[PDB]
Each structure stands twice: as C-alpha cells, then as structure tokens.
Amino acid sequence: IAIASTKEVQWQGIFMIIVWLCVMGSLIFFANPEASRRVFAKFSHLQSFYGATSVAFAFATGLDILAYVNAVSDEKRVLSGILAYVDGVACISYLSMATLNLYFLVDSTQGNPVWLMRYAEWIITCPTLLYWCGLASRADRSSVSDIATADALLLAGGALSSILPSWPAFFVFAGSFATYIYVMLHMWGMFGKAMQPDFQPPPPLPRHALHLLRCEIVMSWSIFPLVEFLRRQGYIDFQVGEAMNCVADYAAKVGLAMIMVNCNLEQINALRVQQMHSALTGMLKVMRKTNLSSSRMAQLDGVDDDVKSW
Amino acid sequence: NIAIASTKEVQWQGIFMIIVWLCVMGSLIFFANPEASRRVFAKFSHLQSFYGATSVAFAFATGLDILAYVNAVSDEKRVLSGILAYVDGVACISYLSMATLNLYFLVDSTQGNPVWLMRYAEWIITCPTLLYWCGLASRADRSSVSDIATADALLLAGGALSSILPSWPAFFVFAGSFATYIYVMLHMWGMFGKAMQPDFQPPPPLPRHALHLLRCEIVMSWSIFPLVEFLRRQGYIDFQVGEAMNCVADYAAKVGLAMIMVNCNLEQINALRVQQMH
Ligand SMILES: CCCCCCCC/C=C\CCCCCCCC(=O)OC[C@H](O)CO
Ligand SMILES: CCCCCCCC/C=C\CCCCCCCC(=O)OC[C@H](O)CO
Ligand SMILES: CCCCCCCC/C=C\CCCCCCCC(=O)OC[C@H](O)CO
Ligand SMILES: *C/C=C(C)/C=C/C=C(C)/C=C/C1=C(C)CCCC1(C)C
Ligand SMILES: *C/C=C(C)/C=C/C=C(C)/C=C/C1=C(C)CCCC1(C)C
C-alpha cells in the first residue's frame, strides 16, 4: 500500500544497483580464481548456462522499457518500473556469474559450489517482487513487509544450510521450506482478497489478472526448492539442476512482464466499451430531440429511421 | 494486385508452415547418422546447450505474439502478429529439434564443420513469409513481393549449396547469394518508402515512424548471418562462436519484429483514450 511515484521506482532502482555494485565487489574481494577456473572446468556447460541466461535477460529488460514508456496508465507505469530493475539485476548477475572471478562456498552435501551471487540476486530481487505484489493488490504495509522480510531470510537460510552438517542442514533447510509456504499462502490470500468485485482501493490491474499473478508465482517459484532438494539428495546431476535454475529464473521474472503486456493490451477492450456507450447515448440524445410522427420532412420521420435499421 | 491477407487465410497459411516443416523434420531424421551426430556434439560440447537455450527464448517469444493476437487493436494488426505467431513458433520447434534429435547435416568443404539443414530449413520457411509479411505492412505489388520472396528462398539455398562446392565455385555461389541479399534488402528499404509517404493511397496499417524502424530492424539484424558465415569460413572466428552469434542474431531478427507490433498496438490505445479525454 505504498502507492509510489515514478521517481520512487527510480530511487529504489538506483538503490538495487548500488547495493548490487557493492555485493559484486564483496564477492570479487574473496575470490579464489584458481578454484573458480577449477569449477568452471569440472562443470563445463556452466559458463554457457549462465551466459545464455544473461542474454535472455537482456531482452527481458528491453520488453519492460517498452512497456514502461508505452504504459497505458501512470499506475501500470510504476509496476513495469520495478520489473525493469528486477530483470536488469538478473542480467548483470548472470553476466558476472559467467565472466567474472566470484566468491562461492563448498557445500557439505555433494561438494558442489554455492554461487552466492545468485543468492545475492534473489535476496535483492525476491523481496522487491513481493513488494510488487503489495501494489498490484495494495495489501497492508505490514502484511507485506512480513513476507518480504520472511522471504529474504528464507533464501539466506537455504544458502547457509549447505555448509551445515547433515542434521542442522536438514533442519535449517526444512525451516526455509516452511517459510516458503508462508509466503505463498499469504500471497494467494493477498491477491484473492483484491480480486473481490467489491474492493476499495481498486487495484491497478484488472481483477482476473491477479489470479494469473498468484498462479504464475506459485508454480514458478516452487521449482527452486524442488531442484535444491533433489540435487542435494544426489538424485540429479549438478548441471542438470543448474539448467533448471536458469530457466526457472527466467520464466519467473519474464512471466510477470508478459502479464503486464497482457494487461496493457487488454485496456483496449475497455476503450472499445467506452466507445460503444458514447455512441449509444449519442443515438439516445438524438431520439430525445426528434419527434417521430407524420412530421413529413423526407418521408414520415419514424419510417425513415425504421428503414435505416432494416 | 497489391497484397492483402485475412484471418482465416493466415490460419491455413500458418498450419501450412508447420506441415511443410513436420515433413522436413522427418526427412532429416530419416537421412540422419546418429553415430556422426554424437561426434559433433562431442567435439562441439556447447552446441546442444546453445540450441536448447535458444529454444527456450523462442518459446516465450511465441506466446508474446498470442497476446498481441487476442488483444489486437485492429483487424489488420491482428493478421500481422498472426504471421509472427507461426514464424516464431517454428524457431522454437526447430531449435528444440536441433538440440534433442538425431538430424541430417552436411560437412562443409571449407573447415569440416557441420551444416545444420534443420536450421536452413527453418529460414526457408521463415524468410519468404516475413517478406510476404512485409508486403502487408507496406502493401507492395504481389509481383514485387513474389520476386524477393522467391529470391530470398533461393538465397538461403545457394549459401547452403556453397558449403559443399570446391574452393573456386563456392566463392561465387556464396557471393552470388550475398549479391541477391542486397537485392532483397534494397527492394525492402524502398518497399517501406512507398508506404512511409504522408500522402499514400492505401493507408498502411503502421504509422510512418514504425515503418522506418522495420526497414532498419530488418537491415541491421539480417546482415549478421552473411557476416558470421563469412568470418567463419575464412576462419576468423571459432565455429561455436559463430553459432552463438547465429543463436542470438536469430532471436533479434524475429523478436525485433514482435516488439514493434507491441509498441504500435500500445501506442494506439494510449492515443485512443487520449482522444476520448478530449
Ligand atoms: C547468506 C547469503 C549471503 C549472500 C551474500 C551477499 C548478501 C547480500 C544480499 C542482500 C543484502 C541485503 C539487502 C537487501 C535486504 C532485503 C531485506 C528485505 O526483506 O526487505 C524487504 C523490504 O522490507 C520490502 O519493503
Ligand atoms: C501466401 C503466402 C505464402 C508465403 C509462404 C508461406 C509458406 C512457406 C513455406 C515454404 C516456402 C518455400 C518458398 C516459397 C516462396 C514464396 C512464394 C511466393 O512467391 O509468395 C508470394 C505471394 O504471392 C505474395 O503475395
Ligand atoms: C548504405 C545502404 C543504403 C540503404 C540500403 C539498405 C540495404 C543495405 C543492405 C546491405 C548493405 C551491406 C550489408 C553489410 C555487408 C558488410 C560486409 C563488410 O563490409 O565486410 C567488412 C569485413 O568483413 C570486415 O571484417
Ligand atoms: C527470481 C528468483 C526467484 C523468484 C527465486 C525464488 C526462490 C524461492 C522462491 C525459494 C528458494 C529456496 C527455498 C524455498 C529453500 C532452499 C533455498 C532456496 C533458495 C532454494
Ligand atoms: C529468422 C531467420 C532469418 C531472418 C534468417 C536470415 C538469413 C539471412 C538474412 C541470410 C543468410 C545467408 C546469406 C545472406 C549468405 C550465405 C547463406 C546465409 C543463409 C548464411
């Protein structure tokens, strides 16, 4: 329920990039390039997996900068503003993940890397996307910062659960998953309470589209805990798990933009509903000013119009 | 006379693009050599990953045009995104098949690299359609379009046949195809020009500004392929480098069109509710 202006979405956007331009430098300071080259060789397709995701996110932002300029309203404008920066961070993250010497941690389950840059992306992105849901539905400013902060610590636990021994990993990882359902349960009830046809303040998106948001987010964010579960269990390869993470990272953020584009293209029907009513009352005003009986000015006035409808 | 389309006509034109490609996919699985394809994806490990990534990029790019079709401003700006909804879908199933199927290919005489006929069979189905599609954004002669459409169809074929020829003739058949490429592009730049006139007889379904963008998007995005194969056959870049460029250039040329229809449809609604405020 922030109801922020375009200059606020710029101020939050420059904060995300400077709080990122600090994160990358932090992860470049602790770099061990001998092992980064060793990991980017033992797992060959990684530099291609992440480099392909960065290019895919480059066009993802271009689709938002078009939706931002050509936005139908100033309400839907500031919504594509947050997605413009959230998807831009996804591109500079995977660009650096695929070309830079970054900091990662050995995990206890299988000895795999923990990219931390991608975790540092989600802790910058995922809280913002829940604040984004706090505007498409206009929930309470507290009920949003609840799940917003609960989802930030959520990602942190699953990151700092890979280092832990067997049992404290299971218990910290299971603690993050329980918090996940909390975020997805409050959201489904956050949009569901905004979809009611009797709801002030009327949401900046149509009522039906909110169901698409609480559907797309639920069944796209669920992939990440499902991959970290299987891969730690040892039931899928590391790269096969990384490939899913890169595509799920794409479908989750891009899925919102295509819904924003869908909404901006749907107000055209709303325009064509207003055009109908205007031309209906316009023909109504003429009937309220004419007299329709035997007033012979062409034929009888009534049959002239009746022949027109015939 | 001129060049027009209709919704049900692009629907049957759409399903013709897929059945002439389904036939193509069968022929290339039929003549394929799986023992030789395994060697390709072995030496070039990133090939299978590139195509599968390109396919994912095109899967979403198709669905964006479906939203432009159901929520189109005009009956003509519908049958324009309709062509792209089939063009961009072929790219999704072409790259999904290139990354997951045993396909037929050829060894080029220049450097022994593979020549992906499935991709060549994609452009032969795409490029002549986008030029029929360019005959609807500008409404050129059905003869002026049939020329470039059949000249671009043989253009991609000549560049494919050039790989199998010896030294001397491959030079001239390749150069003979690039000479026709400029013939296609020169006719396009002047094809939008006739419609870009503020006093044109059949008003084009696009504004004058959006038409100059198209003749710039199609010039600067299509010129990459004749530069990739050039710098790859000469040996100035690795094969996988030219494939990654071909995997990105193939996305820009077709999503560049998809984002023009979005911005024009969006520019139309914002202009229309303004004309309602007044
Ligand atoms: C253990 C993983 C370590 C990774 C290594 C890099 C860490 C840097 C990442 C984030 C910095 C914190 C800045 C963002 C903090 C967001 C907290 C939050 O939830 O804010 C929501 C907001 O209240 C909605 O209105
Ligand atoms: C009716 C438009 C159909 C366009 C193609 C869709 C099917 C593409 C499949 C194979 C193309 C093989 C090469 C075909 C060469 C183009 C044929 C042509 O000249 O069409 C011009 C049309 O008359 C201008 O209105
Ligand atoms: C000026 C154009 C006026 C309007 C006409 C529109 C049509 C343009 C179409 C093709 C032009 C040539 C395509 C680009 C070919 C460049 C090849 C080249 O210059 O090669 C340099 C060399 O490869 C370095 O490494
Ligand atoms: C754009 C990136 C997004 C939306 C990432 C979302 C991640 C989640 C919704 C959940 C992640 C995890 C858990 C629920 C538990 C284990 C740790 C994670 C990060 C895999
Ligand atoms: C969607 C796919 C498109 C737009 C493909 C376009 C291909 C070209 C514009 C050109 C291709 C070639 C040449 C000009 C010369 C050598 C042969 C080709 C196919 C590389």
Residue numbers in the entry:
A (entry chain B): 44 to 353
B (entry chain A): 43 to 320
Q: What text does the study give?
A:
Enzyme rhodopsins comprise the N-terminal rhodopsin domain and C-terminal enzyme domain, connected by a linker, and function as light-activated enzymes. Rh-PDE derived from Salpingoeca rosetta (SrRh-PDE) was first identified and exhibits light-dependent hydrolytic activity for both of cAMP and cGMP, whereas it lacks pump or channel activity. SrRh-PDE consists of the long N-terminal region, transmembrane domain (TMD), including the rhodopsin domain, C-terminal PDE domain, and 76-residue linker region connecting the TMD and PDE domain. Here, we present crystal structures of SrRh-PDE–TMD with and without the linker region, at 3.5 and 2.6 Å resolutions, respectively.
To obtain structural insight into the full-length Rh-PDE, we determined the 3.5 Å resolution crystal structure of Rh-PDE–TMD with the linker region (TMD–Linker, residues 33–378). The TMD–Linker structure superimposes well on the TMD structure (RMSD value of 0.84 Å over all Cα atoms). While the crystal packing is different between the TMD and TMD–Linker structures, both form a similar dimer interface. In the other protomer, the C-terminal residues are observed up to His320 and also adopt a straight α-helix. In the dimer, the α-helices in the linker regions cross each other, suggesting that the PDE dimer is swapped between the TMD dimer. Although the crystal packing might affect the conformation of the linker region, we can interpret its structure and connectivity with the TMD. In this model, TM7 is connected to the PDE domain via the linker regions crossing each other, resulting in the swapped position between the TMD and PDE domain.
